[PDB]
């Protein structure tokens, strides 16, 4: 099935003697070198899409001071999150995938895995927080609220709290950062066992706290928001903008949900089927399927929630 | 709290709405407190207050349906508020009051007196609709929202109309703030 290592796991049998370290040999026996050529080029593509959108969001807020409102902070956060994925992830991956094997050593492996994962988690919980904010604002559940800058700060801070609750444990001994898939990119070890780092407890913790809870919250919040807008539209049959808002909001909520399922249900399904189907074995081609869907969110969560968001189309 | 400007005419009926307890009334409903400001809006009485109202939720504009003399006064006062640089996006709640006095007025006084171009038969359902159309004709603001209601002189209970309209205004604005619609 695979070559077990301390800092690594290469999905390829050593009974032949061919396998080498992912910190060592160009992994052209996992896949022909054309595949790693494309790999490095693809990281540069997403650098040249992600940093444009995500930096420009920050820049625009500076330029136009009309946008500096509490509700937009978590989208600024989202932009920030994806820039970790550009530099911690894509740039340092660029300098390794160009070779075929991970260049900056296992300490660079922890740095890459950490900052990439930190950005991905900040984005995840930014979207959870965004749904929560819109729920409270529109549905008015508490009904004795104002929502000021203090609440926006708590919302942003909470995403960093949760992101660290995921990205930092592999730095102290709860799971490990290792090269996954084609072994040029380091991430969480959700796919092997390791009793020294307690991978099983980490993976279960991940699946529930960092998937099921975010998904439940996002479905619930946007569900209540759509119900509220539908209900308002029902009562004001002759109010054109509410009928418009009903249709537009529902279009966007469906987009939001599908974006989040595309982004995370790959890792969720892969890790869960690794967990319950122990009699299995996957190689780099399929171990990078979930990495694919998650990494590209650095582009199209900024598109879906910032570009399409009606307070930034007017700067365009 | 909600800021509601209350405009119209001296004999339009807002004098009765304001009493449901710059002249400020503090009526309330559904854990939501309203600040209702009875002000003038003529021209000469409009620079006295327009510069110190900001964050006005809605403008309640009243019209005496039976009063043809003040009709064009109200049409132009309306136009000059609805299209006013401070209230170009502040949604309007339009009461056409004295519905029944108009229902009897129109029987003995054709609508053509103040709209000569009117070609319809002088029946309540058509003349009142024509008046409503004339006020909304002046909107000239894409997504303004004008919430209309025709009030049975004093014989009705039209505070609910105000609050449904205000909630609709509020949810539209909160969506706007979130970046949705
Ligand atoms: C380029 C790669 C990055 C930023 C990879 C990030 C990966 C994660 C944040 C993965 C998280 C999860 C698990 C490890 C298991 C359960 C599902 C997730 C998404 C919560
Ligand atoms: C597997 O065998 C290759 C053949 O030399 C060797 O280079 C590598 O270190 C071995 N790794 C493990 C984990 O046995």
CB distance B175–A252 less than 8 Å? no
Question: Torsion angle of alpha carbons A235, B32, B159, B170, nearest 10°?
Answer: -40
Fold of A1-316: Rhopdopsin 7-helix transmembrane proteins (1.20.1070)
The reply to whether residue B178 touches residue A242, judged by beta carbons under 8 angstroms, is no
Q: Measured between alpha carbons, how far is A43 from A295 in angstroms, rounded to an integer?
A: 10
CB A264 within 8 A of CB A211: yes
The two tokens of residue B7 are 């405009």
* DSSP string of chain B, one letter each residue: -EEEEEES-TTSSHHHHTT---EEE--EETTEEEEEEE---SSTTTTTTGGG--S--EEEEEEETT-STTHHHHHHHHHHHHT-TTSSSS-EEEEEE-HHHHHHHHHHS-GGGT-TT--S---HHHHHHHHHHHHHHT---TT--EEEEE--TTSS--HHHHHHHHHHHHHHHHHHHHT--
Query: Which residues of chain B make contact with A126, given a CB cutoff of 8 A?
Result: none
Nearest C-alpha of chain A: how many angstroms from B27?
18
Sign of the C-alpha dihedral, residues A71, A75, A76, A81? positive
Helix, strand, or coil here: A27? Answer: coil
The coordinates were experimentally obtained by X-ray
- Burial (CB < 10 A; 0-12, 13-18, 19+), residue A213, is middle
Cβ pair A232:B177 closer than 8 A = no
Expressed in Å, this structure's resolution amounts to 3.1
* Mutation choice for ligand 1 from A117, A169, A209, CB with most ligand atoms inside 8 A: A117
Query: Are the C-beta atoms of A232 and B168 separated by less than 8 Å?
Result: yes
What is the spatial distance between Cα A306 and Cα A110, in angstroms, rounded to a whole number? 30
Q: Which residues line ligand 2 (CB under 6 A)?
A: A 3, 5, 14, 17, 19-20
- What's the alpha-carbon Rg for chain A, to the nearest Å? 21
Phi-psi region of B13 (alpha: psi -120 to 50; beta: other; left: phi over 0): left
For residue B31, give the nearest of A143, A239, A240 by CB distance. A143
Angstrom distance (rounded) from CA A127 to CA A158: 12
Residues 125-144 in A contacting B (C-alpha not used; CB under 8 Å): 133-134, 137-138, 143-144
The DSSP string of A108-139 is HHHHHHHHHHHHHHHHHHHHHHHHHHHIIIII
Contact B2, B159 (CB under 8 A): no
Q: Where is the binding site for Zn(2+), in residues of A? A: 200, 278
Mutate to test the interface with A, among B2, B175, B177 (most CBs of A within 10 A): B175
Tell me how far apart the alpha carbons of residues A22 and A30 are, in angstroms, rounded to a whole number.
10
Binding-site residues of A, in ranges, read 200, 278
Rounded to whole angstroms, the Cα distance separating A157 from A145 reads 20
On whether the CB atoms of residues B14 and B40 are closer than 8 A, the answer is: no
Q: Would the CA dihedral through A215, A115, A162, A221 be positive or negative?
A: negative
Nearest-neighbour CA in chain A from B149: distance (Å) = 12
Q: Could you give the angle at which helices A199-207 and A240-276 cross, rounded to 10 degrees?
A: 160
- Distance from the alpha carbon of residue A238 to the mean position of ligand 1, in angstroms: 47
CATH code, residues B1-181? 3.40.50.300
Task: Check pocket membership of A120 for ligand 1, CB cut-off 6 A.
Answer: yes
Domain ranges of chain A: 1-316
**What is the CA angle A119-A123-A129, rounded to 5?**
140
Per-domain boundaries in chain B: 1-181
Tokens at residue B171, please? 């949810």
Question: Does the C-beta of A176 come closer than 6 Å to ligand 1?
Answer: no
Q: How far is B78 from chain A (nearest CA, A)?
A: 20
Closest chain A residue by Cα to residue B170: A138
Q: Which residues from B are below 8 Å from A229, CB to CB?
A: 171, 175
Q: At what angle do helices A213-235 and A240-276 cross, to 10 degrees?
A: 160
Per DSSP, the three-state class of A177 is strand
Which residue has its alpha carbon closest to ligand 2 atom 10?
A20
Q: Which residue is closest to B173 within chain A, CA to CA? A: A138
The answer to whether A309 faces chain B, any CB pair under 8 Å, is: yes
């Amino acid at each position: 099935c695979g070559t077990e290592g301390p800092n690594f796991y290469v999905p390829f049998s050593n009974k032949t003697g061919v396998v080498r370290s992912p910190f060592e040999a160009p992994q052209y026996y996992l896949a022909e070198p054309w595949q790693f050529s494309m790999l490095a080029a693809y990281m540069f593509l997403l650098i040249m899409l992600g940093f444009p959108i995500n930096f420009l969001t920050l820049y625009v807020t500076v330029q136009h001071k009309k946008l500096r409102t509490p509700l937009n902070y978590i989208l600024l956060n989202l932009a920030v999150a994806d820039l970790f994925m550009v530099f911690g992830g894509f740039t340092t991956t660029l300098y390794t995938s160009l070779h075929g094997y991970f260049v900056f050593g296992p300490t660079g492996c922890n740095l890459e895995g950490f900052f990439a994962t930190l950005g991905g988690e900040i984005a995840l919980w930014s979207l959870v927080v965004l749904a929560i904010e819109r729920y409270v604002v529109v549905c008015k559940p508490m009904s004795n609220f104002r929502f000021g800058e203090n609440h926006a700060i708590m919302g942003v801070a909470f995403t960093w709290v949760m992101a660290l609750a995921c990205a930092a444990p592999p730095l102290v001994g709860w799971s490990r950062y290792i090269p996954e898939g084609m072994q040029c990119s380091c991430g969480i070890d959700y796919y092997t066992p390791h009793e020294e780092t307690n991978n099983e407890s980490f993976v279960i913790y991940m699946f529930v706290v960092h998937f099921i809870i975010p998904l439940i919250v996002i479905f619930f919040c946007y569900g209540q928001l759509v119900f509220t807008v539908k209900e308002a539209a029902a009562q004001q049959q002759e109010s054109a903008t509410t009928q418009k808002a009903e249709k537009e909001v529902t279009r966007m909520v469906i987009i939001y949900v599908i974006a989040f399922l595309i982004c995370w249900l790959p890792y969720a399904g892969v890790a869960f089927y690794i967990f319950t189907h122990q009699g299995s074995c996957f190689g780099p081609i399929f171990m990078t399927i979930p990495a694919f869907f998650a990494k590209t969110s650095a582009v199209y969560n900024p598109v879906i929630y910032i570009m399409m968001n009606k307070q930034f189309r007017n700067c365009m | 709290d909600v800021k509601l400007l209350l405009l119209g005419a001296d004999n339009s009926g807002k004098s009765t709405i304001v009493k449901q307890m710059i002249v400020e009334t503090h009526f309330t409903f559904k854990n939501l407190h309203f600040r209702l400001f009875d002000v003038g809006g003529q021209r000469s009485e409009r620079k006295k207050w327009i510069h110190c109202f900001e964050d006005v939720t809605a403008i309640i504009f009243c019209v005496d349906l039976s009063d043809y003399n003040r009709m064009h006064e109200s049409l132009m006062d309306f136009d000059s508020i609805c299209n006013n640089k401070f209230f170009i996006d502040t949604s309007i709640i339009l009461f056409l009051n004295k519905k029944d006095l108009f229902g009897e007025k129109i029987k003995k006084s054709p609508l053509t007196i103040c709209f000569p171009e009117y070609t319809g038969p002088n029946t309540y359902e058509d003349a009142a609709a024509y008046i409503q159309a004339q006020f909304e004709s002046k909107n000239r603001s894409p997504n303004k929202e004008i919430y209309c209601h025709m009030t049975c002189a004093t014989d009705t209970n039209n505070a609910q109309v105000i609050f449904d309209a205000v909630t609709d205004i509020i949810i539209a604005n909160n969506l706007r703030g979130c970046g949705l619609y």
